[PDB]
Amino acid sequence: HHHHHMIRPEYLRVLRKIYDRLKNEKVNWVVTGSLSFALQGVPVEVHDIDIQTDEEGAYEIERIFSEFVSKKVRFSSTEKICSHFGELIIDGIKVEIMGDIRKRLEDGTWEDPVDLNKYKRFVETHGMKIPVLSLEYEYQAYLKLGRVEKAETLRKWLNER
Ligand code: NA
Ligand code: NA
């Protein structure tokens, strides 16, 4: 953990609550977003918890954490990214559930969702074996989001004309 950076205990507490209910379920899930970076030693503050999973996993997670569901899992799509998307709030912390995230391809097709198991690693942390997507994958994913943002920004700037 570069910089001996520590994840704020509120996030670890909620992560434990999530881990405890998923650990012995057949759910294909990973922590993604900032918490995945942090768990893998990148000193970044976490503000919410992102769980990426497959389509079935999103609905299973929602059911497992039914009392915490703030937004029902629904297939949700922009023109760029879609997923089976819902939200939990646990102890005031937002948990984004994203099942089978797919990115739009140049041709308008949707990429197949990632094989989470190609990139999943288990981080031993605070007595928990937490599945995360690899830093390499995460970095590449954010850089890709970045490209999308840049293209959209340029389009919007031009649209203002
Ligand atoms: Na920590
Ligand atoms: Na799995």
Ligand code: NA
């Ligand atoms: Na960290």
